[PDB]
Symmetry: D2
Subunit: 120 residues, 4 copies
C-alpha cells in the first residue's frame, strides 16, 4: 500500500516504491523552502507489520542537494502508514541545516506532515 504517489498538506509530492524487504526509494519535491524540483530519497519500512489494527512504521531522508541547488540541509520523516478507505501516512520530521558550532542551537526545525494519495 505504501508504493505510490503521495501529497502532503503543503502540496509537496512523495513518489515512493516500497521494496519487498523493507527498502523505500523514490523522489521528493517540496512545495516550500530552499528547494526546487525533485530530490532523491531513501528510507526503510516495516515489511511485516502487526495485524492487530496498528500502522506500519516507516521513515525516509532527503538531503536537499540536486542538480539545481544545494540547501546544505537534510530532512528525515518518521511516521506510520495507516491503511483504510483513504490511506494516509502520518509523520513528524526533523530538518537539520549544516551550521557552525556557534549556530548549532538553531540548526533543526521540527514539524509534522500528513500525506494522502489525493492530487491537489
Amino acid at each position: 500500500g505504501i508504493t505510490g504517489t503521495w501529497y502532503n498538506q503543503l502540496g509537496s509530492t512523495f513518489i515512493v516504491t516500497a521494496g519487498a524487504d523493507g527498502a523505500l526509494t523514490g523522489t521528493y519535491e517540496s512545495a516550500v523552502g530552499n528547494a526546487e524540483s525533485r530530490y532523491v530519497l531513501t528510507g526503510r519500512y516495516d515489511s511485516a507489520p502487526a495485524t492487530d489494527g496498528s500502522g506500519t512504521a516507516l521513515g525516509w531522508t532527503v538531503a536537499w542537494k540536486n542538480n539545481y541547488r544545494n540547501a546544505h540541509s537534510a530532512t528525515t520523516w518518521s511516521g506510520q502508514y495507516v491503511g483504510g478507505a483513504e490511506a494516509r501516512i502520518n509523520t513528524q520530521w526533523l530538518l537539520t541545516s549544516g551550521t557552525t558550532e556557534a549556530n548549532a542551537w538553531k540548526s533543526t526545525l521540527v514539524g509534522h506532515d500528513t500525506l494522502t494519495k489525493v492530487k491537489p
Copy 2:
C-alpha cells in the same frame, strides 16, 4: 570522513558508508530498546557541503526488523557531521512505533544522540 564506525552515548554502534553521490548505507546496533544485533540503515547526506567549517547535513532511517526480531517501529536521525580532531555526528531522532489510531498520540519518542569515532 563519514564512512566508518561511530559510537553513541548509549553504547550503540553506527557503521556507515558514504557514497560519492550522497548515499548512506550500513548497519545500526542499538545498546537499548527492543533491538538485537544489527539492522539495515539507509539515508542521505550532503555530498558538497560548505567549506567554512559548518557541518555536513545528513540523515538516516532504521526500521527495527531484522532476521532475529521485529519491534514494529522505525527511527530517523537528522543531524550534521563535524570533522576534525574531535569529529562528531550530532543528531536528533524520532522513533515512531506502529500504533492503533486511538494510541497514535503516543507513537513517537524524540531524543538526541552524539556519535564519536572513539567510545
Copy 3:
C-alpha cells in the same frame, strides 16, 4: 482572543486566561493518557504580536499531578494562536516522564495538537 475554552483533536479541554502581563493561567483536562480531571497549567504568550498577519507565539506547561493522581510526567506545548472565524491554536508538544538515567533515552514523547473553539 486566547482567553476561554479550547478543544483539541483528541477531545481534550484547555481552559485559559491570557493576562495583560503576558501570563497564561488555567486548567487542562486530557482525554487520553494517565490523567483524570483537571490539572493546573501555566504559560506565557506574546502580548504584542507582529504588526503583520503573523500568529501569536505562546506556550504552556502541565505537570500531571493533581488531587487524584500523579503520572510523574510533564507536557509542554509550544505554538501559535491564529485568530479569525476559524481561530486555532496550533502546537507541538513534548511529554517528559521522570525516568532513571538508564531509561532517559525514552523519557520524551513528541506530538502536535490543534485546538479549536468548537469540539471536533
Copy 4:
C-alpha cells in the same frame, strides 16, 4: 533541589523558584538568539516525584517579549531534574515563532539544553 540559579551549555542563565504548589517562577536570559536581558518564565514540576531513582518531571515557558525587545516567539523546555551529587536538569525544547500561515511549516526549532548550577 530545583530552586536556584542554573546555567546551560550555551551559557544562558535560568533563575528559578520551585514552589510547594508545583509552580516554577523566575527569569531566563539567553546567551544566543533574538534576545536581550531577562525574560519572565513560568512552569510546573512534579512536587511528589517517585522514590525509585527516577528524575523529577518539569517544564517551563518563556515568551520572548520584555521591556526592551520582542522576538514574537516562545520557547518551552520539557525535561527532568536529576538529583545526584552534581544535580542536573536535562531538557528538550520547542521554540515557536509567530509566522504567516504559508510559513507555519518553518515556525518551530527543536533542541536540547542541559543545565547545572556551575557558573561558567
